[PDB]
């Protein structure tokens, strides 16, 4: 089967250089044009560059022309994208794609993530979103945990070591003006369970080797 596998993604500071590659297999590499297409977080597909089957011609999107160079090695079945003068706006998932005589892109890779930022690797601080009157509607209570100020993505969140999955909603991270990410994970459970079960949100941040298991205990702020 046709298979395209990109690599090289990672965190790079603004102004620096980074090279992406794509290993191709399952087809006669030397007779197909190859492309790079990218997709900024939450945005659409943006064509980046193309290289002819024999590598003798290359073209680029206006936004990267002059800064990027696409190349290929037909003896190693590999495609490359050399990126220089990286800008925050170059942050995206980069996909390798095969074209049909410079026509449609019939096969795509799995993509490699490139994050252009000056931020330093940092583990998150985890805060409880305690279940209380303001978060309990009838027999159902909502609770969760705020995973704040980490870099880079991603973090993983589970509840009670994975035993709790129903009603869980782990939201996409949001990039803060500080350059650090933040996300919240919540779950709804029966209010009747609050007194006899401990809820723990397990947070993992591999980039910083951080592991946190925050207990989210019920809280009361009544004068009664």
């Amino acid at each position: 089967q046709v298979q395209l596998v990109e690599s090289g993604g990672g965190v790079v500071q603004p102004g620096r250089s980074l090279r992406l590659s794509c290993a191709a297999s399952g087809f006669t590499f030397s007779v197909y044009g190859m492309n790079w297409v990218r997709q900024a977080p939450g945005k659409g597909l943006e064509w980046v560059a193309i290289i002819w089957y024999d590598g003798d011609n290359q073209y680029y999107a206006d936004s990267v022309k002059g800064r990027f160079t696409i190349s290929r090695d037909n003896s190693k079945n590999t495609l490359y994208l050399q990126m220089n003068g990286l800008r925050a706006e170059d942050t995206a998932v980069y996909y390798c794609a095969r074209d049909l005589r410079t026509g449609p892109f019939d096969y795509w890779g799995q993509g490699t993530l490139v994050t252009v930022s000056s931020a330093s690797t940092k583990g998150p601080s985890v805060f409880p979103l305690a279940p209380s009157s303001k978060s309990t509607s009838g027999g159902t209570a909502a609770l969760g945990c705020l995973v704040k100020d980490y870099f880079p993505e991603p973090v993983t969140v589970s509840w009670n070591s994975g035993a709790l999955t129903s009603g869980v909603h782990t939201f996409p991270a949001v990039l803060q003006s500080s350059g650090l990410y933040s996300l919240s994970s919540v779950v709804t459970v029966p209010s009747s369970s609050l007194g006899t079960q401990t809820y723990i949100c397990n947070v993992n941040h591999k980039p910083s080797n951080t592991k946190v298991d925050k207990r989210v205990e019920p809280k009361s702020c009544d004068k009664t």
Partner: protein
Amino acid sequence: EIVLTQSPDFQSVTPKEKVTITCRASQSIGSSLHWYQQKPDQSPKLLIKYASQSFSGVPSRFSGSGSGTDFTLTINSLEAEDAAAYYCHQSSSLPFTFGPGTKVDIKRTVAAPSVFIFPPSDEQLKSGTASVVCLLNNFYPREAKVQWKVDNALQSGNSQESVTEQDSKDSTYSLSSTLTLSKADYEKHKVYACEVTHQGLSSPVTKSFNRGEC
């Protein structure tokens, strides 16, 4: 560069019904227009090549058509697995370009969100910051509006929100909104509220608390 525009930006469809997406090129491109389907956290897949030729393995309920500048992708008898983003791409002239995309989701009956609000934890306050969280749970359609008010004053520029992908079981969405203030600023006000507006709510729903309560 030739610019492609797509409409609509978002479309909801009841299973078995029809989705119609259009793509317009800023310049004529003949029949060199292709369509791709992309699901969340997945790579795009070729659907239609050269305006109307179905790609191998693509069900016949998909039909692409048009030539010149206006093109159409129709998905007849929509199935759940068709909920995805759709993109057009022209290969007529370099530089090659894509449309902004169209998201198709599954249409169901309106479902009002259940709203919950969370005051900042004592732990975070001690660290010098106060994040207030408002949760809008399991609603439909996707469009929802959250407005923060502190002592009844409307806030702007100090909150961020995130939305989940459509649930595969109940077809609903969930949204979180976070208001962030310095500890000092948080302690200068009494009432914190999030006002939610949504189709499932005849009147806006407001959840609030006095600082110090929960």
